[PDB]
Design an enzyme around this catalytic site. Structure first.
Site, PDB file in Angstrom:
ATOM      1  N   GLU A   1       0.817  -1.206   0.000  1.00  0.00           N
ATOM      2  CA  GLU A   1       0.000   0.000   0.000  1.00  0.00           C
ATOM      3  C   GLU A   1       0.852   1.258   0.000  1.00  0.00           C
ATOM      4  O   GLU A   1       0.361   2.321  -0.388  1.00  0.00           O
ATOM      5  CB  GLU A   1      -0.964   0.000   1.192  1.00  0.00           C
ATOM      6  CG  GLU A   1      -0.409   0.583   2.483  1.00  0.00           C
ATOM      7  CD  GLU A   1      -1.481   0.858   3.511  1.00  0.00           C
ATOM      8  OE1 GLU A   1      -2.656   0.555   3.233  1.00  0.00           O
ATOM      9  OE2 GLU A   1      -1.152   1.377   4.597  1.00  0.00           O
ATOM     10  N   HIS A   2       2.112   1.163   0.426  1.00  0.00           N
ATOM     11  CA  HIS A   2       3.043   2.257   0.186  1.00  0.00           C
ATOM     12  C   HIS A   2       3.370   2.368  -1.296  1.00  0.00           C
ATOM     13  O   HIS A   2       3.348   3.463  -1.867  1.00  0.00           O
ATOM     14  CB  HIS A   2       4.316   2.050   0.998  1.00  0.00           C
ATOM     15  CG  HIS A   2       4.271   2.659   2.363  1.00  0.00           C
ATOM     16  ND1 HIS A   2       3.467   2.168   3.367  1.00  0.00           N
ATOM     17  CD2 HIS A   2       4.934   3.712   2.894  1.00  0.00           C
ATOM     18  CE1 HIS A   2       3.635   2.894   4.457  1.00  0.00           C
ATOM     19  NE2 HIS A   2       4.523   3.836   4.197  1.00  0.00           N
TER      20      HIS A   2
ATOM     21  N   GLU B   1       9.036   5.415   9.485  1.00  0.00           N
ATOM     22  CA  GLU B   1       7.615   5.573   9.771  1.00  0.00           C
ATOM     23  C   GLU B   1       7.219   4.830  11.040  1.00  0.00           C
ATOM     24  O   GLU B   1       6.487   5.365  11.874  1.00  0.00           O
ATOM     25  CB  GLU B   1       6.796   5.072   8.582  1.00  0.00           C
ATOM     26  CG  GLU B   1       5.373   5.599   8.469  1.00  0.00           C
ATOM     27  CD  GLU B   1       5.292   7.090   8.196  1.00  0.00           C
ATOM     28  OE1 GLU B   1       5.426   7.903   9.134  1.00  0.00           O
ATOM     29  OE2 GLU B   1       5.081   7.451   7.020  1.00  0.00           O
TER      30      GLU B   1
END
Lengths: 102, 445, 78, 420
Positions: B59-60, B136
């Site tokens: 999804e990144h 992150e």
């Protein structure tokens, strides 16, 4: 009610005897949650006057003395300073209780 | 107008099935803007602890370019029409959604044509997203609420695929390769697990024609012909306690096992949460809030905030509360919180049930305002229930809850159960597990 | 005429600061005392920003709008 | 089927606008021109305390009754404030929302403002200011508006630390009696009819004069504020004076905002069609975020550049963004970029008016500003009339003006106003 009830109220005010300690009526009320909240809602001037009158009364009852008769709190000049605050606290407590009933 | 027929005046979601088994559902309203999204049954619960961060990494990479539009050109296709492109991944559902105007409704489907079909994974993007995701998670571990919820899932579902985080451990992030992402996309981005939802100014027939013409080539066929089963998970009553006294104040979550999606008594549990509710230090009501936990928490200044959650998954879930407070009140908060649960098992009266039903009704209608929440509910409902539940059905299910079945359900799920505890921060006064286990029942019952 | 503090007549002790590591025999006039002041409220640890992807959208673009509520948390949106 | 919004201007100046959604849920708001704009230096932080003290006792409903009756029907009561105006909102079910308005009108029309309750929630003022100042963008915009104006717009949203414990109920009574007047209010309803709203306006709202007190015209100041507080990132806003709400150049300034970049259209994107982000991305190699700031008010506006950068890289980020704007102001831009900016702006407007909160906020804002509600199609049509020459004029307006700067962080290499 017209003739002697006011006269009996004056005589009972003299006979009860908190006027000769300089106290007002509402100083003599025993604290509850309602009375403590009503005292907490008082402004600073009336609160300080009440606490000075209370400790003056405790000083006088220490020495088993009373005030001079000209310094006795007069029946007509006796103001009911606390009882609107107390009535508002009682009214909102009754509102909370009747909401908790239903 | 009565609430029931006003709820019936809401337009109905239209659902249809392609030959691939992909579902296409749309809801039409009068808005000039539409929200179109793709929902896939591909979360961290479908992973086997060597691809534990495959969904997050994918999804990144999903907005970084396709095999037809190389990289930033895709960005232009979103940014030259003012559309907002978004994605998220839960432990079970992964969504790629986009908000645009109605006039741009065909071309934007083109983007959802090739985001979930023809993703191109350049290797420079692989190491760039690798160290981006590393920093992150190094940012995300500062947020104590996410840490507490991940700890709660770790200690509640030990040894199961549902304990692991969506992002996964740091060692897999430095170990996922191109072929592993290709295998994850091949196994999990299949045709009958995908729901194309649209909400707002869309028509179902035009959306079906576009959905056919674009997504008619999604796979439906298996690679190794071995069906990935979605097994039951064993809930484990336990605790985890991370003691860090340098932190200013502590986050503590206590949960018990809840039923999931398919069980209708979930709705009853929602009303129970609506009795207890939530409280924050920046509220307005003060001592006069109806929730007795919130009233005692502001009367004694016990907690900074608390909330109640009912998280669900396939035939399982968590049900409980999470509070952040200073250390010196922690156990007292626990005591008061546990007391509220016991009241909901024993002394549930119709006044608070009516209040919780009204709160749940207002929250449920007001949550479904906006094309993005409506599209989210459509996609999540067709992934979970297999159908969209109209709000009139929710109103009929809410209206059948009285105090008797409320305390029956709460005695089923709360009374004398083994909870899962997760603490973080100065949690020395957080009680030992035998004290919480003793607080899960009353001797007066 | 050096001694930059004594260049200014009344502004000698304002431009300078004179701590006393070992206080001598003569006490200074106006000893001084802090009042017992209050304490700031405690708040949770915030979100640091360690990457370009998290920092996106954090730059303000619209005027500040605050919102309070009876049972909804207070918020500020830019 | 959402038929038509109906509009009504009463002779005392009160506005009533309502729409018959036939929705399951009703939303009713009251918009008062009683923001932080209307305080002098004597009563700073009064509007913050009034915003927090909306849920107190009223002459007609007690605070226990207000809180328990709002939570009993599951409705929501919210107060939303800016520098210009305040807004009160109740949300509920259609069958209950009528009595909900009763609570709302008490909060607007007859507040007792008892002294002990105000003394109770001054601590709530302190807590709310701490929570809102936990974000650094709040204090940047607060210091920026303080420096950018002399009077009537330098007053903060959040109460200063000296006025806490110094606000009395007489100041709140004065603020209510001087700014909650009849011709400064718009009553907006969604999910209701006109007759009930006219009835409750005839009941509660039709007693005050209407003109109230005007204000102090918001004279521009200029300057800079630099607050060294030691964080990892340095925030810096550089603004200049711009056209107000209702001027013909506010649309050009909004187009220039969305042309220079006002938000990420893609989650975890690279901001390809943002000019400032393009310039700082080709410049630097560290985390950053640069955007264009627009804030238009009733008689003034601010337009500028917001930068979040590293401590040792703030000068090159700020200079790269400022030179990007200087290159825009010379006419170095394409027509397709302006078309994409117009698409971004009208898309943001249309997705801002979609929910009931944003819709009712826009109706109340239009009623308070212009006194005549316009459909969204008219707003898009006047967006479409913006030429690129007016955008170049807006950029030259920003470049050739007296800038106001607000900065926070490690200011070792952060430049100054004359150094730009």
């Amino acid at each position: 009610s017209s003739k002697w009830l006011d006269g009996f109220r004056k005589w009972y005010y003299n006979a009860a005897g908190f006027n000769k300690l300089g106290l007002m009526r509402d100083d003599t009320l025993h604290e509850t949650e309602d009375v403590k909240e009503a005292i907490r809602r008082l402004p600073e001037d009336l609160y300080n006057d009440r606490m000075f009158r209370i400790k003056r009364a405790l000083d006088l009852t220490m020495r088993h003395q009373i005030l001079p008769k000209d310094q006795w709190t007069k029946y007509e000049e006796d103001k009911f300073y606390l009882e609107p605050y107390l009535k508002e606290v009682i009214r909102e407590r009754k509102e909370r209780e009747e909401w908790a009933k239903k | 107008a009565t609430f029931a027929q006003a709820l019936q005046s809401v337009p109905e979601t239209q659902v249809s099935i392609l030959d691939n088994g992909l579902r296409v559902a749309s809801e039409q309203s009068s808005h000039a803007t539409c929200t179109v999204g793709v929902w896939i049954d591909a979360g961290s619960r479908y992973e086997t602890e060597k691809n534990n961060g495959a969904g997050y990494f994918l999804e990144h990479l999903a907005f970084k370019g396709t095999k037809n539009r190389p990289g930033n050109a895709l960005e232009k296709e979103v940014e030259s029409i003012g559309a907002h492109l978004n994605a998220y991944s839960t432990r079970e559902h992964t969504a790629y959604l986009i908000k645009a105007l109605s006039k741009d409704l065909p071309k934007v489907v083109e983007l959802l044509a090739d985001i979930v079909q023809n993703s191109s994974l350049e290797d420079s993007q692989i190491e760039k997203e690798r160290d981006v995701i590393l920093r992150e998670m190094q940012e995300n571990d500062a947020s104590m609420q996410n840490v507490v919820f991940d700890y709660l899932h770790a200690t509640a579902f030990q040894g199961t695929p549902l304990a692991q985080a969506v992002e996964g451990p740091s060692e897999n992030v430095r170990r996922l390769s191109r072929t592993d992402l290709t295998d994850y996309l091949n196994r999990h981005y299949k045709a009958p697990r995908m729901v194309l939802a649209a909400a707002g100014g869309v028509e179902h027939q035009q959306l079906l024609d576009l959905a056919q013409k674009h997504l008619s080539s999604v796979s439906r066929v298996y690679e190794e012909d071995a069906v990935p089963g979605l097994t039951p998970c064993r809930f484990t009553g336990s605790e985890i306690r991370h003691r860090d006294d340098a932190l200013p104040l502590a986050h503590v979550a206590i949960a018990v096992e809840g039923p999931g999606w398919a069980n209708p008594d979930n709705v009853t549990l929602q009303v129970a949460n609506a009795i207890i509710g939530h409280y924050d230090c920046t509220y307005g009501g003060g001592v006069h809030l109806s929730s007795p936990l919130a009233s005692v928490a502001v009367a004694n200044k016990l907690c900074q905030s608390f909330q109640t959650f009912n998280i669900s998954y396939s035939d399982t879930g968590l049900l409980g509360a999470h509070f952040v407070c200073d250390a010196m009140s922690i156990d007292d908060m626990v005591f008061f919180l546990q007391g509220q649960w016991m009241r909901l098992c024993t002394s549930a009266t119709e006044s608070e049930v009516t209040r919780g039903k009204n709160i749940l009704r207002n929250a449920l209608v007001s949550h479904l305002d906006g094309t993005t929440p409506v599209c989210e509910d459509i996609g999540r409902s067709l992934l979970t229930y297999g159908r969209r539940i109209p709000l009139a059905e929710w109103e009929s299910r809410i209206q059948e809850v009285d105090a008797q079945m409320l305390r029956d359900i709460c005695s089923k799920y709360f009374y004398d159960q083994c909870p899962a505890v997760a603490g973080y921060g100065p949690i020395e006064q957080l009680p030992d597990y035998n004290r919480i286990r003793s607080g899960m029942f009353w001797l007066r019952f | 005429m050096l001694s930059v503090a004594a260049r200014s007549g009344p502004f000698a002790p304002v431009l300078s600061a004179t701590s006393r590591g070992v206080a001598g025999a003569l006490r200074p006039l106006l000893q001084g005392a802090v009042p017992a002041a209050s304490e700031p409220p405690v708040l949770d640890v915030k979100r640091p920003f360690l990457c370009r992807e998290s920092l996106s959208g954090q730059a303000a673009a619209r005027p500040l709008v605050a919102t309070v509520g009876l049972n909804v948390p207070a918020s500020v949106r830019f | 089927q959402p038929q038509d919004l109906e509009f009504t201007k009463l002779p005392n100046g009160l506005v009533i606008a309502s729409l018959e959604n036939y929705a399951p849920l009703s939303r009713i708001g009251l918009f008062v021109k009683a923001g932080s704009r209307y305080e002098d230096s004597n009563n700073l932080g009064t509007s913050h305390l009034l915003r927090l003290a909306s849920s107190l006792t009223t002459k007609g409903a007690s605070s226990f009754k207000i809180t328990r009756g709002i939570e009993a029907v599951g409705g929501k009561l919210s107060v939303t404030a800016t520098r210009e105006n305040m807004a009160y909102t109740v949300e509920g079910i259609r069958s209950d929302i009528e009595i909900l308005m009763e609570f709302l009108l008490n909060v607007t029309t007859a507040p007792e403002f008892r002294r002990w309750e105000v003394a109770a929630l001054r601590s709530q003022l302190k807590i709310d200011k701490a929570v809102a100042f936990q974000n650094s963008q709040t204090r940047i915009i607060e210091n920026l508006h303080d420096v950018a104006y002399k009077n009537a717009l330098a007053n903060p949203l959040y109460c200063p630390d000296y006025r806490m414990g110094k606000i009395t109920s007489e100041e709140l009574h004065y603020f209510v009696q001087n700014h909650f007047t009849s011709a400064r209010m718009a009553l907006v309803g969604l999910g209701v009819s006109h007759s009930v709203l006219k009835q409750v306006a005839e009941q509660f709202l039709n007693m005050r004069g209407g003109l109230g007190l005007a204000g102090a015209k918001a004279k521009y100041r200029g300057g800079e504020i630099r607050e060294q507080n030691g964080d990892n990132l340095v925030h810096a806003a550089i603004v200049a004076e711009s056209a107000a709400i209702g001027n013909a150049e506010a649309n050009a300034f909004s187009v220039l905002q969305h042309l220079l970049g006002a938000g990420p259209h893609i989650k975890r994107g690279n901001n390809t069609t943002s000019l400032l982000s393009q310039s700082v991305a080709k410049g630097s190699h560290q985390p950053f975020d640069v955007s264009a700031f627009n804030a238009s008010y009733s008689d003034s506006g601010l337009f500028g550049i917001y930068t979040i950068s590293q401590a040792a890289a703030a000068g090159e980020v700020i200079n790269a963004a400022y030179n990007q704007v200087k290159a825009v102001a010379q006419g170095n831009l394409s027509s397709a970029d302006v078309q994409a900016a117009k698409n971004k702006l009208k898309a943001g407007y249309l997705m801002s008016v979609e929910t009931s909160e944003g819709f009712l906020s826009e109706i109340g804002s239009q009623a308070l500003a212009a006194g005549s509600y316009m459909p969204p199609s008219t707003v898009l049509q006047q967006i479409d009339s913006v030429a690129d020459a007016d955008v170049v004029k807006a950029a030259k307006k920003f470049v050739s003006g007296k800038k106001s700067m607000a900065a926070s962080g490690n200011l070792g290499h952060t430049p100054f106003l004359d150094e730009l």
